[PDB]
Amino acid sequence: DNHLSIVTLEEAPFVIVEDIDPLTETCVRNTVPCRKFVKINNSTNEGMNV
Amino acid sequence: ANLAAFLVLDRPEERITGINDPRLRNPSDKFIYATVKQSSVDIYFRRQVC
Structure with a gap:
């Protein structure tokens, strides 16, 4: 059971989700899918699972 | 008393104290500041967790 799902919201200044930059990079650095x-x-x- | 207070509490030249200064944190359009080019300042900014 090494893979466990985590659910989060974006209503507080603690979690922010941003679109991946279209420059063949995965949100530059210091990011979580x-x-x-x-x-x-x-x-x-x-x-879609963007 | 008013003269002394307004002379010792005039406009201060202290506008920033370092990277941790709150005034530097906010990217407000009122105070515009940026690096000249892609020099080591850019690398230092890119190499920060927050």
Whole structure:
């Protein structure tokens, strides 16, 4: 059980999620991979793991 | 008393004390400051955890 999921919010000045820069780099340095369900349409609830 | 207080509490030349100065922390548009080029200042800024 070495892989455990962690869930976090972005309502406080302690966790901030930013889009990865389109310069073949993974958020430069000092970052942790994250997942967020980005809604596509006002009806469909499908979210890509960006 | 008013003259003495307003003379000893005039405008101070102290505008910054170091990297930990709160006035340096805020990137407000009122106070604009930046490095000249990509010199070692840029590397030091990039090599900071926060």
